[model samples]
Target: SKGEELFTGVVPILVELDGDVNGHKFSVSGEGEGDATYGKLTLKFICTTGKLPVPWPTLVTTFVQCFSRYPDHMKRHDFFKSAMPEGYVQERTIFFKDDGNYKTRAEVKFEGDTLVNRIELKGIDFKEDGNILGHKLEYNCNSHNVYIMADKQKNGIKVNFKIRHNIEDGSVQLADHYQQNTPIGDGPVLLPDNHYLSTQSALSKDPNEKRDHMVLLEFVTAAGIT
Candidate 1:
């Protein structure tokens, strides 16, 4: 019962994505911790990219295996599955590569239970390159390392994050990683009392798309004292 007792008062945080990339349709789903007593929280990010490049399957499997070793934590009363206390949301964009191919990269950041400053350069990869180079490709090369800080007077909770990639050498980078002095809102907003759960269904831009992504989060109260 230790696990149950420890997980009491814990709240589940859910994240879902519904959108299309190129002609391919895809979705991303994951869960994170929600509550103060948990102290720290992490989320296990699971994504399904539709119609990926030839070698994408192998690349994704390898990434998942590598990601499994990361640590997990709890914040206030919330639980998170991350190697660090910080959290991140990614947005992909198509850009030209030095090799003359279009590719996508992710923008990652740290968010959760803190002053909202300082995020580490987690990692990056190219959709096309992963397939071509296969295991030989360093998905993340030295030329691809980039860090970004908050712009002047741009203090506010970010509704979404963006990922920028350089075309020439396949370098990836992150920007607008934190909110300055802005209160955390409810339901992906600032406060908890205003939280409301709702779901909507929509058709994909692609007619042949299949496999929709779903996310779930479970919440429970903390254990009682003997």
Candidate 2:
């Protein structure tokens, strides 16, 4: 669960970027972490489609590439030395390629980072034409979320995303799982019982009750909506 802790700790560090297509805007957010041994990052894109975009494949590639550029900025963080034991260098070239159908390829080479002994992705491929609720469409999208659990493991990063194709008549369909085995569906559906609003509420309260109780109540109320 160390990965989970790191994920939680780095939540605010995540940056969001917005993309506009045909007057509609899509949002993407990403976060990264570094330690004495290596560094990893993840990006999430969010959008709703009443009708699928024709050049859907190209759009997905663009979004993933934005996140792939994050490592350069990550080098400036204080944790970089501790996270990447090999030390950070300025001449690194990180590349992200199109893996065909809804997928992307990533590679990174460092000049003198010995702490990061190795960085590579395996078992990744492109995804092409597929049905999103019986629509005849072709698109390529993929997930690239890296989860680093330890400094010694060869495979410690996890990357993934979600794809949706809107039909011709303005109906939406979830096309594929961007990462691993996440399910597909139309519209935003909340998971059952796993809801964390209650947990947020519990954590919001102060043992000394020093702050305004109404403010705490309002915070929880607003949080549950989104």
Quote the lDDT for 121 in model 1: 17
lDDT of 2: 0.25
Q: Whole-model lDDT, candidate 1?
A: 0.26
- Give all TM-scores, in the order shown: 0.28, 0.24
lDDT of 2 by residue, 144-222 (tens): 2222112122212222333344444554444333321111222221121111111111012235634222111101110
Instruction: State the lDDT at 52 in candidate 2.
Output: 31
Q: Residues 22-126, candidate 1, lDDT per residue (tens digit)?
A: 333444554555332332234443455543322221112111000111112212111112212222232223222332222222322223422121211112333
What TM value does model 2 have? 0.24
lDDT for 214 in candidate 1 is 22
In candidate 1 the C-alpha lDDT for residue 63 amounts to: 15
**What is the lDDT for 51 in model 2?**
39
For each candidate in the order shown, give its overall lDDT on alpha carbons. Answer: 0.26, 0.25
- Pairing residues by index, what is the TM-score of model 1? 0.28
